[PDB]
Ligand binder design. Structure first.
Ligand SMILES: C[C@H](c1cccc2ccccc12)N(C)Cc1ccc(O)cc1
Ligand SMILES: [Zn+2]
Length: 314
């Protein structure tokens, strides 16, 4: 009986020394097993594997607890989906563009590039250690883990077409946004006034208008009565807001917004670009960079810096 020593892990924080029988597969000994993302379940140990870290599914109570504390999910399929995706995302290129980690276009990843660029520019704190750790590695240029985690947390596979808004909405579920608050007032000529308070994700996201200033002045929405009513923002407590709408021609003015998602196409096939306001307006399109003083284009999401707003409407 010849053997080597390897580490197994669910989180790559807590390594568990194992003695492996070189006659048997990794699958026979540990169950499903991954080496740097590669499925080695059906492979036999090699002498070069001495002292290397393998990922395994949480198949015991110690590991289930470690996995839950790192990823904040009990979904048994999660590690398999993370590893499947990582196997592809570790072959992507992560260009530095304008001081930010982007992604070179591959596998319809334009929505992930736009999400990743947005996350580097808004004040957001992840709860799962897995996302905290992977985000700091992405800020440093190696975003492969962060991208694979986003794909796993969103239940998306590499190659699938994606929506920036739908993606930020899953990521915001795993962010600490508990002390974010929004107060709206709706005015109908028929039904009268209605004041609502929103907490967490619903307090930082709005679908129907790109303009934060228009949301403060009032926007037309269908009432339940069938008339148009006016919704306006009474109070906002959050480090940012995301205003979204089906894509339309829109003017972005330097200094009036943090960043935005341009989308060219239809629901079914399209391409995202990212626009950011610095000393001028930069358009980051994967690896490709352009700049201009002004932008007019099909915008679907705009991000605004915020702290505390109270309306002056009485
Ligand atoms: C920005 C764009 C979109 C959102 C909302 C309304 C739209 C209307 C027309 C065209 C695109 C639209 N999304 C990328 C669509 C989409 C939504 C979910 C997906 O899984 C893949 C693509
Ligand atoms: Zn009404």
């Amino acid at each position: 009986v010849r053997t080597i020593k390897v580490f197994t892990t669910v989180d790559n924080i807590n390594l568990h020394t194992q003695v492996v029988d070189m006659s048997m597969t990794y699958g026979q000994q540990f169950g499903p097993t991954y080496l740097d993302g590669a499925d080695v379940t059906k492979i036999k140990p090699h002498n070069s594997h001495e002292g290397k870290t393998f990922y395994v599914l949480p198949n015991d109570d110690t590991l289930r607890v470690e996995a839950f504390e790192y990823y904040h999910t009990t979904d048994p399929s999660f590690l398999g989906r993370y590893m499947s995706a990582l196997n592809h995302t570790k072959k992507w290129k992560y260009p530095q563009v304008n001081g930010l980690t982007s992604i070179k276009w591959a596998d319809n990843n334009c929505y992930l590039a736009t999400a990743l660029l947005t996350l580097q520019q808004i004040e957001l704190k992840f709860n799962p250690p897995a996302l905290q750790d992977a985000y700091y590695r992405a800020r440093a240029g190696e975003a492969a883990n962060f991208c694979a985690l986003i794909l796993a947390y969103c239940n998306k596979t590499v190659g699938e077409l994606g929506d920036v808004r739908e993606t930020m909405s899953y990521l915001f579920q795993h962010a600490n946004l508990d002390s974010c608050k929004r107060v709206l007032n709706v005015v109908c000529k028929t039904c009268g006034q209605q004041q609502t308070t929103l907490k967490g994700v619903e307090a930082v996201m709005y679908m129907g208008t790109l303009s934060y200033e228009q949301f403060k002045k009032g926007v037309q929405i269908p009432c339940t009565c069938g008339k148009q009513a006016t919704k306006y923002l009474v109070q906002q407590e959050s480090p940012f807001v995301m205003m979204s709408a089906p894509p339309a021609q829109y003017e972005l003015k330097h200094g009036t917004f943090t960043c935005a998602s341009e989308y060219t196409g239809n629901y079914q096939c399209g391409h995202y670009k990212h626009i950011t306001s610095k000393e001028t307006l930069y358009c980051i399109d994967g690896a490709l960079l352009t700049k201009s003083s002004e932008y007019k284009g099909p915008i679907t999401d705009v991000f605004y810096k915020e702290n505390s707003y109270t309306t002056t409407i009485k």
